Coordinates of N, CA and C in Angstrom, one line a residue:
Chain A
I11 N 24.6 12.4 -7.7 CA 24.2 11.4 -6.9 C 22.9 12.5 -6.6
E12 N 23.4 14.3 -6.6 CA 22.2 14.6 -7.3 C 21.1 13.6 -8.3
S13 N 21.0 13.7 -9.7 CA 19.9 12.8 -9.6 C 20.0 11.4 -9.3
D14 N 20.4 10.9 -8.8 CA 19.5 9.8 -7.9 C 18.8 10.1 -7.0
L15 N 18.8 11.2 -6.3 CA 18.6 12.0 -5.1 C 16.9 12.5 -5.5
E16 N 17.1 12.6 -6.6 CA 15.8 13.8 -7.5 C 14.7 12.8 -7.6
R17 N 14.8 11.6 -8.1 CA 13.9 10.7 -8.4 C 14.1 10.2 -7.2
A18 N 14.5 9.8 -6.9 CA 14.8 9.3 -5.6 C 13.2 9.2 -4.3
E19 N 13.1 11.0 -4.1 CA 12.5 11.5 -3.6 C 10.9 11.4 -5.0
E20 N 10.8 11.6 -5.6 CA 9.5 11.8 -6.4 C 8.5 9.8 -6.8
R21 N 10.2 9.0 -7.2 CA 9.7 7.9 -6.6 C 9.0 7.8 -5.2
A22 N 9.8 7.9 -4.3 CA 8.8 7.6 -3.1 C 7.5 8.3 -2.6
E23 N 7.9 9.7 -3.1 CA 6.3 10.5 -3.1 C 5.7 9.4 -3.8
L24 N 5.6 9.0 -4.7 CA 4.9 8.7 -5.6 C 4.5 7.6 -5.3
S25 N 5.4 6.0 -3.8 CA 5.5 5.6 -3.9 C 4.2 5.5 -1.6
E26 N 4.5 6.7 -1.4 CA 4.0 7.7 -0.7 C 2.5 7.3 -1.3
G27 N 2.5 8.0 -2.1 CA 0.6 8.1 -2.7 C -0.6 7.3 -2.8
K28 N 0.3 6.2 -3.3 CA 0.4 4.8 -3.1 C -0.5 3.7 -2.3
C29 N 0.4 4.8 -1.3 CA 0.2 3.4 -0.2 C -0.8 3.4 0.5
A30 N -0.9 5.4 0.3 CA -2.2 6.3 0.9 C -3.3 6.1 0.3
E31 N -3.7 5.5 -1.4 CA -4.7 5.3 -1.9 C -5.2 3.6 -1.7
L32 N -4.0 2.9 -1.4 CA -4.2 1.5 -0.7 C -5.4 1.4 0.7
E33 N -4.8 2.4 1.4 CA -5.1 2.2 2.6 C -6.6 2.9 2.3
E34 N -6.8 3.6 1.3 CA -7.6 4.4 1.7 C -8.9 2.8 0.8
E35 N -8.5 2.2 -0.1 CA -9.1 0.7 -0.2 C -10.1 -0.8 0.7
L36 N -8.5 -0.4 1.3 CA -8.6 -1.4 2.5 C -9.9 -0.5 3.3
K37 N -9.6 0.5 4.0 CA -11.0 1.3 4.8 C -11.7 0.6 4.2
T38 N -11.9 1.0 2.8 CA -14.0 1.1 1.7 C -13.8 -0.5 1.6
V39 N -13.3 -1.7 1.4 CA -13.5 -2.6 1.6 C -13.1 -2.7 3.3
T40 N -13.3 -3.4 4.2 CA -13.4 -3.7 5.9 C -14.9 -2.6 6.0
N41 N -15.3 -1.6 5.6 CA -16.0 -0.9 6.6 C -17.3 -1.7 5.4
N42 N -17.0 -2.5 4.3 CA -17.7 -3.3 2.9 C -19.0 -4.6 4.1
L43 N -17.1 -5.1 4.1 CA -17.3 -6.6 4.8 C -18.1 -6.3 6.6
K44 N -17.7 -5.9 6.9 CA -18.7 -5.4 8.6 C -19.6 -5.4 8.5
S45 N -20.2 -4.9 7.1 CA -21.5 -4.3 7.0 C -22.2 -5.6 6.3
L46 N -21.4 -6.6 5.9 CA -22.2 -7.5 4.6 C -22.1 -9.1 6.3
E47 N -21.4 -8.2 7.5 CA -21.1 -9.6 7.9 C -22.5 -9.4 8.8
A48 N -23.5 -9.1 8.9 CA -24.4 -8.7 9.9 C -25.5 -10.0 9.5
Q49 N -25.5 -9.6 8.5 CA -26.7 -11.0 7.6 C -25.8 -12.5 6.5
Chain B
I5 N 24.3 13.0 1.4 CA 23.5 12.6 0.5 C 23.3 11.2 -0.6
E6 N 24.7 11.0 0.3 CA 24.7 8.7 0.8 C 23.5 8.7 1.7
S7 N 23.8 9.2 2.7 CA 23.0 9.6 4.3 C 21.3 9.3 3.6
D8 N 21.3 10.6 2.8 CA 19.8 10.8 2.6 C 19.2 10.0 1.6
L9 N 19.9 8.8 0.3 CA 19.9 8.1 0.1 C 19.5 6.6 0.3
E10 N 20.1 6.2 1.5 CA 19.9 5.3 2.1 C 18.7 5.7 3.4
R11 N 18.2 6.1 4.6 CA 17.1 6.4 4.6 C 15.9 6.3 3.6
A12 N 16.3 7.1 2.4 CA 15.1 7.0 1.4 C 15.0 5.6 0.6
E13 N 16.1 4.8 0.7 CA 16.4 3.0 0.5 C 15.6 2.5 1.0
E14 N 15.0 2.5 2.8 CA 15.1 2.1 3.6 C 13.7 2.6 4.1
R15 N 13.0 3.6 3.3 CA 11.7 4.4 3.8 C 10.8 3.7 2.6
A16 N 11.4 3.5 1.3 CA 11.2 2.7 0.0 C 10.8 1.1 0.5
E17 N 12.0 0.5 0.7 CA 11.4 -1.1 0.9 C 10.3 -1.3 2.0
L18 N 9.8 -0.1 2.8 CA 8.7 -0.2 3.8 C 7.6 0.0 2.9
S19 N 7.8 0.5 2.3 CA 6.5 1.2 1.8 C 6.5 0.1 0.6
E20 N 6.9 -0.9 -0.6 CA 6.8 -2.1 -1.2 C 6.6 -2.8 -0.3
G21 N 6.8 -3.2 1.2 CA 6.9 -4.6 2.4 C 4.8 -4.2 3.1
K22 N 4.8 -2.9 2.9 CA 3.4 -2.4 2.8 C 2.5 -2.4 2.0
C23 N 3.0 -2.5 0.8 CA 1.8 -2.5 -0.6 C 1.6 -4.2 -0.8
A24 N 2.3 -4.9 -0.6 CA 2.2 -6.3 -0.7 C 1.7 -6.4 -0.2
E25 N 2.4 -6.0 1.5 CA 0.9 -6.8 2.3 C 0.0 -6.9 2.5
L26 N -0.7 -5.2 1.5 CA -1.8 -4.3 1.7 C -2.8 -5.2 0.6
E27 N -1.5 -5.2 -0.5 CA -2.5 -5.4 -1.2 C -2.6 -7.5 -1.5
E28 N -2.0 -8.0 -0.5 CA -2.4 -9.5 -0.3 C -4.1 -9.9 0.3
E29 N -3.7 -8.4 1.3 CA -4.8 -8.4 2.1 C -6.3 -8.5 1.5
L30 N -6.7 -7.3 0.3 CA -7.1 -6.9 -0.9 C -7.4 -7.6 -0.9
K31 N -6.7 -8.2 -1.7 CA -7.4 -10.2 -2.4 C -7.8 -10.8 -1.9
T32 N -6.8 -11.7 -1.0 CA -8.0 -12.6 0.2 C -9.6 -11.7 0.6
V33 N -9.9 -10.6 1.4 CA -10.7 -10.6 1.6 C -11.5 -9.8 0.4
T34 N -11.3 -9.3 -0.3 CA -12.1 -9.7 -2.0 C -12.3 -10.8 -1.8
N35 N -12.1 -11.6 -2.4 CA -11.7 -13.6 -2.7 C -13.4 -13.9 -1.6
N36 N -12.5 -13.6 -0.1 CA -14.0 -13.8 0.6 C -15.2 -13.6 0.0
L37 N -14.9 -12.2 0.5 CA -16.9 -10.8 0.1 C -17.1 -12.1 -1.1
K38 N -17.4 -12.1 -1.9 CA -17.7 -12.2 -3.3 C -17.7 -13.9 -2.6
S39 N -17.2 -14.5 -2.3 CA -17.4 -16.3 -1.8 C -18.9 -15.6 -0.6
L40 N -18.7 -15.2 0.0 CA -19.8 -15.5 1.0 C -20.9 -14.2 0.1
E41 N -21.0 -13.6 -0.8 CA -22.2 -12.9 -1.5 C -22.7 -14.1 -2.3
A42 N -21.8 -14.7 -3.1 CA -22.2 -16.1 -4.0 C -23.3 -16.8 -3.6
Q43 N -23.4 -17.3 -2.2 CA -24.2 -18.4 -1.1 C -24.5 -18.9 -2.5

């Protein structure tokens, strides 16, 4: 169970980093869309 | 440790749900942006 826990924490951290990267990409794309929607 | 694994799995599945939702949102928004830019 300790072996389960260690890589479970590792993959949770990796998924959190991926979530942060995806959120940053969403922010960038929504700023781009807001800029383009002017005209 | 069983409780730790339980809420770690809960947070994990929430993470994949958020990742899937944001990925599909990015796909649709990029498709819309490309279609609008094509004009």
